[PDB]
Amino acid sequence: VDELLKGELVPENLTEDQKKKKKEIMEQESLWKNPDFKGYNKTFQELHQLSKTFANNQFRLALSNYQSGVNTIMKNRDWVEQYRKEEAEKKRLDEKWYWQKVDRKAREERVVYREKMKAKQDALNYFSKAINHLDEIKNPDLRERPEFKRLLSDVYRSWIMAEYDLQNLPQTIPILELYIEIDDNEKEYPAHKYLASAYSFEENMIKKTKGPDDMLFKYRYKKNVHLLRATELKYGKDSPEYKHIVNVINRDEVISV
Amino acid sequence: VDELLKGELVPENLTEDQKKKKKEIMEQESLWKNPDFKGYNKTFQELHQLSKTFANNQFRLALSNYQSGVNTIMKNRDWVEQYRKEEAEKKRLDEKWYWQKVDRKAREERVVYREKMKAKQDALNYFSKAINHLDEIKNPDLRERPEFKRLLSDVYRSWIMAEYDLQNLPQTIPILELYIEIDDNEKEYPAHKYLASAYSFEENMIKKTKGPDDMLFKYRYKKNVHLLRATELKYGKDSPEYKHIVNVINRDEVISV
Amino acid sequence: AALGLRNPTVLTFISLSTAGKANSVIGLCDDALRVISKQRADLGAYYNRMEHAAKG
Amino acid sequence: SEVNKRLRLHTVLFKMKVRTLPHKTVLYKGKPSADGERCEAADKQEAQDNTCLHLEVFDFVGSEDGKSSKNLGAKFKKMELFFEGSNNADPDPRKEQPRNLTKIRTYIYQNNFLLEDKVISVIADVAPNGEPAHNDKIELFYQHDDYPVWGTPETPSEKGVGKYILSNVENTKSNPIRNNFKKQFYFKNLDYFDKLFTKIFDYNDRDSNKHYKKNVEALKGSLKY
């Protein structure tokens, strides 16, 4: 069931009485046909924001950007694999010491790391444009369609993964909490694995900069909740990994005896 | 018992003798019908201010402005509630440090606070016009009708709450004293609560500017009179809160052993 | 944002708190300087032309 | 026109509490008074025994010049709807079938203080439903400066002055008075109040929706800890 197979949000074309209304309105617009008309009051023309054609174009705009952002990530992975292949095949006629190999090997790691972060940044800009297009659809009826929920979760997942590689952990928390509220995404353990790390970053910063204890507990409480939930979804309840995490969480939090 | 149900001050519409009298007066005006007549001596025409038709229009002029003033307050609260909801529901994709969240909240409060004072001033302008309209009703018999008191109490009460939020406490003292003379309005503890703060401000200004000790003691006396009344009205005598205020007042006030 | 010192979508600006980041900012400032330098050349050319027209 | 049937749908207002009204608009329910000429206020506005709607809109003389505060006069136009029969036993106003209309009354008032000119026009349609053309059951009252006294019928020797019915009005091709009365005023007069009656119901019903959302929203605040 590929909800994005047809590449649109909602299909478009029944009652004879309704078809009678469509006839007279089209006749009315023909009398008042003025292609140069621009409305001083935008309230009436803003009703087009609720139309299915409007939402269709917004979805196809967001879909257009999402494919661009995934392309940057995937084309980069191809380059890194190809880049390493070429280096091993060229002749090193001026290397007769082990330390020279480490120096040559160290350069490749930096070249690889340099291109990855460049590619990650391009994807995030592409993903961010797609997010704004999705959020300017004002009809809740069309926002519940399986086509919308498929791309909305797909966009957030790609945005979060790119953001975490750029080490912008605190920005993933607001997006991830919206991600796990769509369909059965809350049952995905990676979604709670990322929030386990992201909330740990928040706790460390509050600890480092010596913020309030209330915010310290909140980030610690959220960190343990999603650390446990991620453990349960992957290793199952009452499992040896689950028992270990509960011991860690019990030590990490406060218990009143 | 909605006194303002019909939206009028006095009902406007029986003796056979009075019916005969009205007939001949209507006949007299018919002979002397001259719409262009402008009286040089305004004294006789001003007797219209003592009629019931005059009071009906003045009452509905004050009622019209009261609704505009009340609508200004109500629309502002809805805007602030909607504004806070919208801000929390958008994405802060460039916000990874807790001090950015503090800065973001500060801007929202500055916007929210600014809109309130702008709404209070516009609402206050409408309330004062209603006050002017009610004070040009020159019939004491019509002033004592239950419809008049119901509107006058609402106009005075709304003005005091709007002007207090603009930090103009001394202006509210004469209005509150007008307010507590209408039926059982003195049996409201919030009315005496406002007077307790308003007289406290007056005493501080005398103390700060080193004014007369006579004015210092008068505002102190008025402050303690209404402070104790609101304590009794809301918490009652022989209550722990009521005994607290007596200790506070006795500590503040001058006692002659 | 127009000078390349900020992202016109994310709205994050350049940072120097890491040695690796700071080295790539040198190129960012080189581009930013050329953008400012170019625009002043355009403004300077407009003034010189208008000066001839006012003289004429 | 079938606009009179639309006024029958406004029987849901009896069991609906009125908490939102337009600016300078008065609406209350009651029972017919003596002679059934007008409506009398009810102490309990939510009682089922009430059968009369009272809707009134008022303005000020000279409001087109921006001189409302100058107190040049007063004006109000009110429509009172009369039904027959008691209301449904259930206290839910959302489900309520349209009821028959005993009579439709339109009242027009205007009093100009500077010119001492007062006009009172009263229209009572005692057969709103039953026949599209019922001109003999459309009582019109026209008082101009307290003349004629209330309850004075239009004499045949002095036509147009006082209480009269629309049948006596001529509708010749030379003077299409009946055509103009309905085409210009009466049709728009009924249409105006019809939207206003529906507007008031939709607003008050909308209010009950917000309170339900308020309780659910406040409950979500318990999920933050």
PDB file of N, CA and C in Angstrom, chain A residues 164-246:
ATOM      1  N   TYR A 164      19.955  15.547  13.291  1.00  0.00           N
ATOM      2  CA  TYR A 164      20.789  14.906  14.302  1.00  0.00           C
ATOM      3  C   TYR A 164      22.235  14.778  13.842  1.00  0.00           C
ATOM      4  N   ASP A 165      22.462  14.622  12.536  1.00  0.00           N
ATOM      5  CA  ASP A 165      23.828  14.538  12.032  1.00  0.00           C
ATOM      6  C   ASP A 165      24.538  15.883  12.107  1.00  0.00           C
ATOM      7  N   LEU A 166      23.791  16.979  12.018  1.00  0.00           N
ATOM      8  CA  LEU A 166      24.334  18.316  12.205  1.00  0.00           C
ATOM      9  C   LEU A 166      24.457  18.691  13.676  1.00  0.00           C
ATOM     10  N   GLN A 167      24.210  17.743  14.580  1.00  0.00           N
ATOM     11  CA  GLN A 167      24.369  17.908  16.022  1.00  0.00           C
ATOM     12  C   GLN A 167      23.412  18.941  16.605  1.00  0.00           C
ATOM     13  N   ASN A 168      22.352  19.284  15.876  1.00  0.00           N
ATOM     14  CA  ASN A 168      21.320  20.187  16.386  1.00  0.00           C
ATOM     15  C   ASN A 168      20.245  19.394  17.131  1.00  0.00           C
ATOM     16  N   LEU A 169      20.678  18.742  18.208  1.00  0.00           N
ATOM     17  CA  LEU A 169      19.792  17.840  18.943  1.00  0.00           C
ATOM     18  C   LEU A 169      18.555  18.524  19.516  1.00  0.00           C
ATOM     19  N   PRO A 170      18.640  19.696  20.158  1.00  0.00           N
ATOM     20  CA  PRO A 170      17.430  20.274  20.770  1.00  0.00           C
ATOM     21  C   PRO A 170      16.311  20.596  19.791  1.00  0.00           C
ATOM     22  N   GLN A 171      16.603  20.786  18.504  1.00  0.00           N
ATOM     23  CA  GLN A 171      15.538  21.061  17.547  1.00  0.00           C
ATOM     24  C   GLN A 171      14.775  19.809  17.138  1.00  0.00           C
ATOM     25  N   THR A 172      15.344  18.624  17.358  1.00  0.00           N
ATOM     26  CA  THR A 172      14.655  17.388  17.016  1.00  0.00           C
ATOM     27  C   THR A 172      13.538  17.049  17.993  1.00  0.00           C
ATOM     28  N   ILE A 173      13.599  17.561  19.223  1.00  0.00           N
ATOM     29  CA  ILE A 173      12.564  17.246  20.211  1.00  0.00           C
ATOM     30  C   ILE A 173      11.186  17.747  19.790  1.00  0.00           C
ATOM     31  N   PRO A 174      11.000  19.016  19.398  1.00  0.00           N
ATOM     32  CA  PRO A 174       9.650  19.439  18.984  1.00  0.00           C
ATOM     33  C   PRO A 174       9.118  18.678  17.783  1.00  0.00           C
ATOM     34  N   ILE A 175       9.988  18.320  16.836  1.00  0.00           N
ATOM     35  CA  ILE A 175       9.537  17.605  15.647  1.00  0.00           C
ATOM     36  C   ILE A 175       9.215  16.154  15.981  1.00  0.00           C
ATOM     37  N   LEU A 176      10.056  15.513  16.795  1.00  0.00           N
ATOM     38  CA  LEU A 176       9.840  14.109  17.132  1.00  0.00           C
ATOM     39  C   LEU A 176       8.540  13.913  17.899  1.00  0.00           C
ATOM     40  N   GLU A 177       8.199  14.847  18.789  1.00  0.00           N
ATOM     41  CA  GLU A 177       6.951  14.718  19.533  1.00  0.00           C
ATOM     42  C   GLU A 177       5.736  14.824  18.621  1.00  0.00           C
ATOM     43  N   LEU A 178       5.834  15.596  17.537  1.00  0.00           N
ATOM     44  CA  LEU A 178       4.763  15.606  16.547  1.00  0.00           C
ATOM     45  C   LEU A 178       4.800  14.360  15.673  1.00  0.00           C
ATOM     46  N   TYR A 179       5.988  13.786  15.476  1.00  0.00           N
ATOM     47  CA  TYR A 179       6.120  12.597  14.641  1.00  0.00           C
ATOM     48  C   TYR A 179       5.427  11.393  15.267  1.00  0.00           C
ATOM     49  N   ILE A 180       5.526  11.238  16.586  1.00  0.00           N
ATOM     50  CA  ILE A 180       5.017  10.046  17.255  1.00  0.00           C
ATOM     51  C   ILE A 180       3.535  10.204  17.570  1.00  0.00           C
ATOM     52  N   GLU A 181       2.910  11.249  17.029  1.00  0.00           N
ATOM     53  CA  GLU A 181       1.476  11.462  17.181  1.00  0.00           C
ATOM     54  C   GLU A 181       0.720  11.256  15.874  1.00  0.00           C
ATOM     55  N   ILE A 182       1.343  10.606  14.895  1.00  0.00           N
ATOM     56  CA  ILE A 182       0.736  10.360  13.592  1.00  0.00           C
ATOM     57  C   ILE A 182       0.651   8.854  13.389  1.00  0.00           C
ATOM     58  N   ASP A 183      -0.571   8.347  13.235  1.00  0.00           N
ATOM     59  CA  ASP A 183      -0.836   6.929  12.951  1.00  0.00           C
ATOM     60  C   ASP A 183      -0.183   6.090  14.048  1.00  0.00           C
ATOM     61  N   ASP A 184       0.562   5.036  13.713  1.00  0.00           N
ATOM     62  CA  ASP A 184       1.198   4.160  14.689  1.00  0.00           C
ATOM     63  C   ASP A 184       2.688   4.445  14.837  1.00  0.00           C
ATOM     64  N   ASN A 185       3.106   5.695  14.625  1.00  0.00           N
ATOM     65  CA  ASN A 185       4.527   6.017  14.699  1.00  0.00           C
ATOM     66  C   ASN A 185       5.056   5.930  16.124  1.00  0.00           C
ATOM     67  N   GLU A 186       4.183   6.084  17.123  1.00  0.00           N
ATOM     68  CA  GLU A 186       4.609   5.973  18.513  1.00  0.00           C
ATOM     69  C   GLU A 186       5.158   4.590  18.836  1.00  0.00           C
ATOM     70  N   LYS A 187       4.836   3.586  18.024  1.00  0.00           N
ATOM     71  CA  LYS A 187       5.289   2.220  18.233  1.00  0.00           C
ATOM     72  C   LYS A 187       6.674   1.959  17.655  1.00  0.00           C
ATOM     73  N   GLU A 188       7.293   2.954  17.026  1.00  0.00           N
ATOM     74  CA  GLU A 188       8.603   2.799  16.408  1.00  0.00           C
ATOM     75  C   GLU A 188       9.680   3.100  17.443  1.00  0.00           C
ATOM     76  N   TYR A 189      10.556   2.129  17.688  1.00  0.00           N
ATOM     77  CA  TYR A 189      11.599   2.305  18.692  1.00  0.00           C
ATOM     78  C   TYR A 189      12.656   3.339  18.290  1.00  0.00           C
ATOM     79  N   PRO A 190      13.029   3.491  17.005  1.00  0.00           N
ATOM     80  CA  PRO A 190      13.987   4.565  16.682  1.00  0.00           C
ATOM     81  C   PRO A 190      13.484   5.950  17.046  1.00  0.00           C
ATOM     82  N   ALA A 191      12.177   6.190  16.928  1.00  0.00           N
ATOM     83  CA  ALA A 191      11.626   7.488  17.303  1.00  0.00           C
ATOM     84  C   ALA A 191      11.832   7.770  18.785  1.00  0.00           C
ATOM     85  N   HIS A 192      11.858   6.722  19.609  1.00  0.00           N
ATOM     86  CA  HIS A 192      12.110   6.914  21.032  1.00  0.00           C
ATOM     87  C   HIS A 192      13.591   6.784  21.361  1.00  0.00           C
ATOM     88  N   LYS A 193      14.385   6.232  20.441  1.00  0.00           N
ATOM     89  CA  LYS A 193      15.831   6.198  20.635  1.00  0.00           C
ATOM     90  C   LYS A 193      16.439   7.579  20.426  1.00  0.00           C
ATOM     91  N   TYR A 194      15.966   8.298  19.406  1.00  0.00           N
ATOM     92  CA  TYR A 194      16.439   9.658  19.174  1.00  0.00           C
ATOM     93  C   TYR A 194      16.052  10.581  20.321  1.00  0.00           C
ATOM     94  N   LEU A 195      14.812  10.474  20.804  1.00  0.00           N
ATOM     95  CA  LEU A 195      14.377  11.318  21.913  1.00  0.00           C
ATOM     96  C   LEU A 195      15.105  10.961  23.202  1.00  0.00           C
ATOM     97  N   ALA A 196      15.605   9.729  23.305  1.00  0.00           N
ATOM     98  CA  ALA A 196      16.433   9.368  24.450  1.00  0.00           C
ATOM     99  C   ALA A 196      17.736  10.157  24.451  1.00  0.00           C
ATOM    100  N   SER A 197      18.375  10.278  23.285  1.00  0.00           N
ATOM    101  CA  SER A 197      19.618  11.036  23.193  1.00  0.00           C
ATOM    102  C   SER A 197      19.359  12.537  23.235  1.00  0.00           C
ATOM    103  N   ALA A 198      18.313  12.998  22.547  1.00  0.00           N
ATOM    104  CA  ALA A 198      18.050  14.431  22.462  1.00  0.00           C
ATOM    105  C   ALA A 198      17.723  15.024  23.827  1.00  0.00           C
ATOM    106  N   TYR A 199      16.961  14.299  24.649  1.00  0.00           N
ATOM    107  CA  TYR A 199      16.646  14.803  25.982  1.00  0.00           C
ATOM    108  C   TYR A 199      17.834  14.683  26.926  1.00  0.00           C
ATOM    109  N   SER A 200      18.760  13.762  26.651  1.00  0.00           N
ATOM    110  CA  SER A 200      19.982  13.694  27.447  1.00  0.00           C
ATOM    111  C   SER A 200      20.867  14.904  27.183  1.00  0.00           C
ATOM    112  N   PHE A 201      20.906  15.364  25.931  1.00  0.00           N
ATOM    113  CA  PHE A 201      21.614  16.597  25.608  1.00  0.00           C
ATOM    114  C   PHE A 201      21.033  17.775  26.377  1.00  0.00           C
ATOM    115  N   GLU A 202      19.704  17.843  26.474  1.00  0.00           N
ATOM    116  CA  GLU A 202      19.063  18.915  27.228  1.00  0.00           C
ATOM    117  C   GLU A 202      19.439  18.861  28.703  1.00  0.00           C
ATOM    118  N   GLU A 203      19.456  17.662  29.289  1.00  0.00           N
ATOM    119  CA  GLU A 203      19.808  17.537  30.700  1.00  0.00           C
ATOM    120  C   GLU A 203      21.253  17.947  30.949  1.00  0.00           C
ATOM    121  N   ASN A 204      22.163  17.556  30.054  1.00  0.00           N
ATOM    122  CA  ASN A 204      23.567  17.920  30.215  1.00  0.00           C
ATOM    123  C   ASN A 204      23.762  19.429  30.144  1.00  0.00           C
ATOM    124  N   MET A 205      23.079  20.092  29.209  1.00  0.00           N
ATOM    125  CA  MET A 205      23.203  21.541  29.090  1.00  0.00           C
ATOM    126  C   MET A 205      22.669  22.248  30.329  1.00  0.00           C
ATOM    127  N   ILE A 206      21.530  21.794  30.855  1.00  0.00           N
ATOM    128  CA  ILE A 206      21.005  22.372  32.089  1.00  0.00           C
ATOM    129  C   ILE A 206      21.965  22.112  33.242  1.00  0.00           C
ATOM    130  N   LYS A 207      22.586  20.932  33.259  1.00  0.00           N
ATOM    131  CA  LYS A 207      23.576  20.631  34.287  1.00  0.00           C
ATOM    132  C   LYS A 207      24.845  21.450  34.085  1.00  0.00           C
ATOM    133  N   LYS A 208      25.293  21.586  32.835  1.00  0.00           N
ATOM    134  CA  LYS A 208      26.508  22.343  32.552  1.00  0.00           C
ATOM    135  C   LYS A 208      26.337  23.817  32.897  1.00  0.00           C
ATOM    136  N   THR A 209      25.276  24.443  32.394  1.00  0.00           N
ATOM    137  CA  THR A 209      25.060  25.868  32.606  1.00  0.00           C
ATOM    138  C   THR A 209      24.368  26.172  33.925  1.00  0.00           C
ATOM    139  N   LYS A 210      24.044  25.150  34.717  1.00  0.00           N
ATOM    140  CA  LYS A 210      23.436  25.316  36.036  1.00  0.00           C
ATOM    141  C   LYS A 210      22.123  26.098  35.948  1.00  0.00           C
ATOM    142  N   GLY A 211      21.155  25.497  35.262  1.00  0.00           N
ATOM    143  CA  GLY A 211      19.826  26.051  35.171  1.00  0.00           C
ATOM    144  C   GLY A 211      18.966  25.642  36.350  1.00  0.00           C
ATOM    145  N   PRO A 212      17.658  25.857  36.243  1.00  0.00           N
ATOM    146  CA  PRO A 212      16.755  25.473  37.333  1.00  0.00           C
ATOM    147  C   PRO A 212      16.668  23.962  37.485  1.00  0.00           C
ATOM    148  N   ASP A 213      16.334  23.537  38.707  1.00  0.00           N
ATOM    149  CA  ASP A 213      16.148  22.112  38.963  1.00  0.00           C
ATOM    150  C   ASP A 213      14.855  21.593  38.350  1.00  0.00           C
ATOM    151  N   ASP A 214      13.852  22.459  38.191  1.00  0.00           N
ATOM    152  CA  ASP A 214      12.596  22.033  37.584  1.00  0.00           C
ATOM    153  C   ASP A 214      12.806  21.597  36.140  1.00  0.00           C
ATOM    154  N   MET A 215      13.530  22.401  35.360  1.00  0.00           N
ATOM    155  CA  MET A 215      13.841  22.010  33.989  1.00  0.00           C
ATOM    156  C   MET A 215      14.768  20.803  33.964  1.00  0.00           C
ATOM    157  N   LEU A 216      15.614  20.663  34.986  1.00  0.00           N
ATOM    158  CA  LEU A 216      16.502  19.508  35.065  1.00  0.00           C
ATOM    159  C   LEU A 216      15.707  18.219  35.224  1.00  0.00           C
ATOM    160  N   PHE A 217      14.698  18.234  36.098  1.00  0.00           N
ATOM    161  CA  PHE A 217      13.875  17.046  36.301  1.00  0.00           C
ATOM    162  C   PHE A 217      13.043  16.730  35.065  1.00  0.00           C
ATOM    163  N   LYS A 218      12.498  17.760  34.414  1.00  0.00           N
ATOM    164  CA  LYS A 218      11.656  17.545  33.241  1.00  0.00           C
ATOM    165  C   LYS A 218      12.423  16.839  32.131  1.00  0.00           C
ATOM    166  N   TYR A 219      13.646  17.291  31.855  1.00  0.00           N
ATOM    167  CA  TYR A 219      14.434  16.667  30.798  1.00  0.00           C
ATOM    168  C   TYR A 219      14.919  15.286  31.215  1.00  0.00           C
ATOM    169  N   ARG A 220      15.207  15.098  32.504  1.00  0.00           N
ATOM    170  CA  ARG A 220      15.562  13.770  32.992  1.00  0.00           C
ATOM    171  C   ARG A 220      14.365  12.830  32.941  1.00  0.00           C
ATOM    172  N   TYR A 221      13.192  13.322  33.344  1.00  0.00           N
ATOM    173  CA  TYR A 221      11.978  12.513  33.299  1.00  0.00           C
ATOM    174  C   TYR A 221      11.649  12.098  31.871  1.00  0.00           C
ATOM    175  N   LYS A 222      11.744  13.037  30.928  1.00  0.00           N
ATOM    176  CA  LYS A 222      11.477  12.714  29.531  1.00  0.00           C
ATOM    177  C   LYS A 222      12.531  11.770  28.968  1.00  0.00           C
ATOM    178  N   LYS A 223      13.786  11.927  29.395  1.00  0.00           N
ATOM    179  CA  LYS A 223      14.853  11.067  28.893  1.00  0.00           C
ATOM    180  C   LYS A 223      14.619   9.615  29.284  1.00  0.00           C
ATOM    181  N   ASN A 224      14.219   9.380  30.535  1.00  0.00           N
ATOM    182  CA  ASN A 224      14.033   8.011  31.006  1.00  0.00           C
ATOM    183  C   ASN A 224      12.759   7.396  30.442  1.00  0.00           C
ATOM    184  N   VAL A 225      11.719   8.210  30.245  1.00  0.00           N
ATOM    185  CA  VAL A 225      10.463   7.698  29.701  1.00  0.00           C
ATOM    186  C   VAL A 225      10.677   7.137  28.301  1.00  0.00           C
ATOM    187  N   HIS A 226      11.396   7.876  27.456  1.00  0.00           N
ATOM    188  CA  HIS A 226      11.586   7.433  26.080  1.00  0.00           C
ATOM    189  C   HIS A 226      12.737   6.445  25.955  1.00  0.00           C
ATOM    190  N   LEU A 227      13.682   6.460  26.896  1.00  0.00           N
ATOM    191  CA  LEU A 227      14.695   5.409  26.925  1.00  0.00           C
ATOM    192  C   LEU A 227      14.069   4.061  27.250  1.00  0.00           C
ATOM    193  N   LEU A 228      13.144   4.037  28.212  1.00  0.00           N
ATOM    194  CA  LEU A 228      12.459   2.795  28.553  1.00  0.00           C
ATOM    195  C   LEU A 228      11.536   2.346  27.427  1.00  0.00           C
ATOM    196  N   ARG A 229      10.778   3.281  26.850  1.00  0.00           N
ATOM    197  CA  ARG A 229       9.839   2.930  25.789  1.00  0.00           C
ATOM    198  C   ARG A 229      10.563   2.380  24.567  1.00  0.00           C
ATOM    199  N   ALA A 230      11.704   2.973  24.213  1.00  0.00           N
ATOM    200  CA  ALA A 230      12.492   2.449  23.102  1.00  0.00           C
ATOM    201  C   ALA A 230      13.021   1.057  23.412  1.00  0.00           C
ATOM    202  N   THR A 231      13.427   0.821  24.661  1.00  0.00           N
ATOM    203  CA  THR A 231      13.913  -0.500  25.045  1.00  0.00           C
ATOM    204  C   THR A 231      12.806  -1.542  24.958  1.00  0.00           C
ATOM    205  N   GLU A 232      11.599  -1.185  25.400  1.00  0.00           N
ATOM    206  CA  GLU A 232      10.483  -2.124  25.362  1.00  0.00           C
ATOM    207  C   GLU A 232      10.108  -2.486  23.931  1.00  0.00           C
ATOM    208  N   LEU A 233      10.100  -1.503  23.029  1.00  0.00           N
ATOM    209  CA  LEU A 233       9.665  -1.763  21.661  1.00  0.00           C
ATOM    210  C   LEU A 233      10.673  -2.601  20.885  1.00  0.00           C
ATOM    211  N   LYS A 234      11.907  -2.712  21.372  1.00  0.00           N
ATOM    212  CA  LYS A 234      12.926  -3.459  20.645  1.00  0.00           C
ATOM    213  C   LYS A 234      13.242  -4.798  21.302  1.00  0.00           C
ATOM    214  N   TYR A 235      13.339  -4.825  22.629  1.00  0.00           N
ATOM    215  CA  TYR A 235      13.681  -6.040  23.352  1.00  0.00           C
ATOM    216  C   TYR A 235      12.500  -6.653  24.087  1.00  0.00           C
ATOM    217  N   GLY A 236      11.336  -6.011  24.068  1.00  0.00           N
ATOM    218  CA  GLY A 236      10.177  -6.550  24.749  1.00  0.00           C
ATOM    219  C   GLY A 236      10.233  -6.372  26.251  1.00  0.00           C
ATOM    220  N   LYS A 237       9.068  -6.334  26.889  1.00  0.00           N
ATOM    221  CA  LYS A 237       9.001  -6.197  28.334  1.00  0.00           C
ATOM    222  C   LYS A 237       9.609  -7.421  29.014  1.00  0.00           C
ATOM    223  N   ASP A 238       9.917  -7.261  30.305  1.00  0.00           N
ATOM    224  CA  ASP A 238      10.512  -8.286  31.163  1.00  0.00           C
ATOM    225  C   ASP A 238      11.596  -9.092  30.455  1.00  0.00           C
ATOM    226  N   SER A 239      12.463  -8.407  29.720  1.00  0.00           N
ATOM    227  CA  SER A 239      13.610  -8.995  29.049  1.00  0.00           C
ATOM    228  C   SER A 239      14.899  -8.595  29.759  1.00  0.00           C
ATOM    229  N   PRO A 240      15.995  -9.339  29.555  1.00  0.00           N
ATOM    230  CA  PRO A 240      17.247  -8.981  30.247  1.00  0.00           C
ATOM    231  C   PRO A 240      17.716  -7.565  29.962  1.00  0.00           C
ATOM    232  N   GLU A 241      17.561  -7.090  28.725  1.00  0.00           N
ATOM    233  CA  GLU A 241      17.867  -5.695  28.431  1.00  0.00           C
ATOM    234  C   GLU A 241      16.910  -4.760  29.157  1.00  0.00           C
ATOM    235  N   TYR A 242      15.627  -5.122  29.211  1.00  0.00           N
ATOM    236  CA  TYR A 242      14.646  -4.282  29.890  1.00  0.00           C
ATOM    237  C   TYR A 242      14.936  -4.188  31.383  1.00  0.00           C
ATOM    238  N   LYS A 243      15.325  -5.304  32.003  1.00  0.00           N
ATOM    239  CA  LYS A 243      15.665  -5.280  33.422  1.00  0.00           C
ATOM    240  C   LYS A 243      16.867  -4.383  33.686  1.00  0.00           C
ATOM    241  N   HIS A 244      17.866  -4.427  32.800  1.00  0.00           N
ATOM    242  CA  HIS A 244      19.045  -3.582  32.962  1.00  0.00           C
ATOM    243  C   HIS A 244      18.684  -2.104  32.894  1.00  0.00           C
ATOM    244  N   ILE A 245      17.820  -1.729  31.949  1.00  0.00           N
ATOM    245  CA  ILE A 245      17.461  -0.325  31.779  1.00  0.00           C
ATOM    246  C   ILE A 245      16.666   0.179  32.977  1.00  0.00           C
ATOM    247  N   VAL A 246      15.789  -0.660  33.531  1.00  0.00           N
ATOM    248  CA  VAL A 246      15.010  -0.249  34.696  1.00  0.00           C
ATOM    249  C   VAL A 246      15.924   0.002  35.889  1.00  0.00           C
TER     250      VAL A 246
END
